[PDB]
Amino acid sequence: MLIAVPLDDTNFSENLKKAKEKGADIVELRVDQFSDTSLNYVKEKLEEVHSQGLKTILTIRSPEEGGREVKNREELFEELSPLSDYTDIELSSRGLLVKLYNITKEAGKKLIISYHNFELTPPNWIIREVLREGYRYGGIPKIAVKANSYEDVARLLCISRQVEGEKILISMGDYGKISRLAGYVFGSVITYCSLKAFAPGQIPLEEMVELRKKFYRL
Amino acid sequence: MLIAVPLDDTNFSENLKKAKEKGADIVELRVDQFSDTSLNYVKEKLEEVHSQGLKTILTIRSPEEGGREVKNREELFEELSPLSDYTDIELSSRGLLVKLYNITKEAGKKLIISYHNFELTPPNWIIREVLREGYRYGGIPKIAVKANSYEDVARLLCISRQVEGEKILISMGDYGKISRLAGYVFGSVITYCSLEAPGQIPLEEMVELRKKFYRL
Numbered sequence: 001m002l003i004a005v006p007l008d009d010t011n012f013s014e015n016l017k018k019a020k021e022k023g024a025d026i027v028e029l030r031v032d033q034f035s036d037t038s039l040n041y042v043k044e045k046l047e048e049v050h051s052q053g054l055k056t057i058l059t060i061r062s063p064e065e066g067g068r069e070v071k072n073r074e075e076l077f078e079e080l081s082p083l084s085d086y087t088d089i090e091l092s093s094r095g096l097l098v099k100l101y102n103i104t105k106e107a108g109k110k111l112i113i114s115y116h117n118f119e120l121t122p123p124n125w126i127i128r129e130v131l132r133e134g135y136r137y138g139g140i141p142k143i144a145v146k147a148n149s150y151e152d153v154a155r156l157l158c159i160s161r162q163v164e165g166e167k168i169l170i171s172m173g174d175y176g177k178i179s180r181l182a183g184y185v186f187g188s189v190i191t192y193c194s195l196k197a198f199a200p201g202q203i204p205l206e207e208m209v210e211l212r213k214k215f216y217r218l
Numbered sequence: 219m220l221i222a223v224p225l226d227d228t229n230f231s232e233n234l235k236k237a238k239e240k241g242a243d244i245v246e247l248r249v250d251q252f253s254d255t256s257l258n259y260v261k262e263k264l265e266e267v268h269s270q271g272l273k274t275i276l277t278i279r280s281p282e283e284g285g286r287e288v289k290n291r292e293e294l295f296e297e298l299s300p301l302s303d304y305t306d307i308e309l310s311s312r313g314l315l316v317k318l319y320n321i322t323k324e325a326g327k328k329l330i331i332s333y334h335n336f337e338l339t340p341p342n343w344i345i346r347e348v349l350r351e352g353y354r355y356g357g358i359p360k361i362a363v364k365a366n367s368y369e370d371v372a373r374l375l376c377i378s379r380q381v382e383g384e385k386i387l388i389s390m391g392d393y394g395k396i397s398r399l400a401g402y403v404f405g406s407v408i409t410y411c412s413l414e415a416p417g418q419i420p421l422e423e424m425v426e427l428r429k430k431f432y433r434l
Contacts, residue, residue: 064228069414119227122253 001184001212002026004057004192005205008033012045015195020052023209026190028057028088031076032067039072039079046084057112058084065090065116082107088142091115091133101138111139112168121145121152121171124159131163140189142168147176157186174200181211219402219409219428220244222275223421226251230263233413238270241425244408246275246306249294250285257290257297264302275330276302283308283334300325306360309333309351319356330386331357339363339370339389342377349381358407360386365394375404392416399427 004026005019019027027049031042037060049056058080061067070076077096081087081103089100091113104111113134121127127143134141143160147153153171157179160169169188171179180191180203194202203211212218222244223237237245245267249255255278267274276298279285288294295314299305299321307318309331322329331352339345345361352359361378365371371389375397378387387406389397395417398409411421419427 063414117253120254126253 001188001216002055002190003205003208003212004028004190005195006030006059006192007195009035009041009045013048016049016052016054018195019205020054022195022205024054024193024205026055026057026085028059028192029084030059030061030067031073032059032061032063032070037070037072037076039076042076042080043083046080055085057086057088059088062090062093064092065114066118078103081109084109086110086112086140088112088114089139091130091137091141097137097139105138111137112142113137113139114142114144114168117145118172119146121147121156124155127156127159128163131160131165131167134167135163135165140166140168142170144168144170144172146173147171147179148173150175152176153179157183160186172201177201177203180208181215184216219407219432220273221421221424221428222246222408222410223413224248224277224410225413227253227259227263231266234266234270234272236413237421238272240413240421242272242411242421244273244275244303246277246410247302248277248279248285250277250279250288255288255290255294257293260294261298261301264298273303275304275306277306280308280311282310283332284336295321299327302327304328304330304358306330306332307357309348309355309359315355315357323356329355329357330360331355332360332362332386335363336390337364339365339374342373345374345377346381349378349383349385352385353381353383358384358386360388362386362388362390364391365389365397366391368393370394371397375401378404390417395419398424399431402432 002025005024006028007015029045046056060070060073063069087104089096101111115130130143131141153176156171166189167187168190169183193205193208220243223242224246225233226248264274278288278291281287305322307314319329333348348361349359371394374389384407385405386408387401398419411424412418413421
């Protein structure tokens with residue numbers, strides 16, 4: 001699996017350098033956490049990541065799913081999606097799905113279609129619908145939901161197998177930590193790390209690199 | 219008119235706070251849009267609205283009218299309709315009308331009997347029949363239909379006058395935007411706003427528009 005680390009624009013150059021040295025394959029630009037969202041500022045950031053040999057995920061999280069409103073969000077996608085290896089758009093932002101799929105497809109890039117639930121792991125039918133809709137819109141479905149028990153972790157992983165295809169599975173919280181490593185066996189293609197952990201369940205980049213080697217020989 | 223803001227379970231507490239601070243009168247719980255519809259998860263949300271001093275509309279939209287299947291739908295109405303200020307049930311959910319009226323009436327609450335058409339504004343006889351049936355079942359009839367022209371908006375508003383009584387009238391879509399503000403003069407008692415689709419109006423804007431146009 002590929003290892004990604006989210007980053008805002010603070011001390012960016014040095015954090016990118018650290019992400020590289022520590023083994024990150026991807027840097028996710030959380031533009032919703034940027035103090036500057038001009039098309040050039042973000043473009044240069046994407047280019048700087050590529051300059052270091054890493055891939056990028058262009059994310060501009062909507063406020064309803066843990067992000068913040070970005071006035072020129074749609075413009076950023078139009079202009080930068082063709083330049084980022086991946087673009088993460090929320091399944092809930094229905095009006096941009098077809099549009100971002102066409103843009104990424106034509107540019108030979110990939111679309112991640114995400115769903116986040118910071119409170120609980122939804123019923124199985126919802127898990128399956130999110131996955132099926134993601135594939136229906138031509139993207140890599142991503143599900144990030146808080147586990148309130150170990151059962152919630154097992155359930156998310158097991159139910160995901162009922163909808164075939166590469167996907168991204170994350171059980172957030174202390175209970176779901178194991179999902180960040182074990183997800184691979186269930187078809188999860190990307191795992192997300194912290195550049196030390198600041199929240200329950202996170203795993204530092206350096207540690208995940210060694211775990212990936214120990215369990216999957218990469 | 220009163221202003222209602224529909225909300226799903228996403229970032230509920232934060233959204234409710236904004237709704238209260240912006241001036242909403244009602245929060246409509248779109249339970250059909252919830253991830254968890256258990257009696258406790260929903261009851262707690264209902265209590266939260268009341269804790270902020272706002273009224274609630276309990277809605278569990280049927281898949282027939284733009285919602286989705288909710289297995290414990292009946293339990294929710296049975297247990298929560300006596301607590302919610304309003305309960306919205308679809309006229310098409312004929313099997314639950316008498317039951318919901320009895321539950322709400324016994325509890326001193328109000329029943330909204332709704333009709334939704336996301337494609338067009340139906341013929342006048344249908345508009346009148348929906349209003350008549352709503353009243354016949356003891357509820358506040360609600361008609362939410364897509365307007366495909368300004369003519370459709372004027373028509374929905376004018377024909378509704380033929381069946382007197384409190385009601386809720388909404389012409390959805392860009393053309394029907396004006397109905398969200400002007401419906402009140404035609405007897406529409408509640409208007410719906412987004413907290414922050416074509417034709418919707420943000421809560422903050424509607425609160426300002428209401429005071430600008432309506433007499434104290």
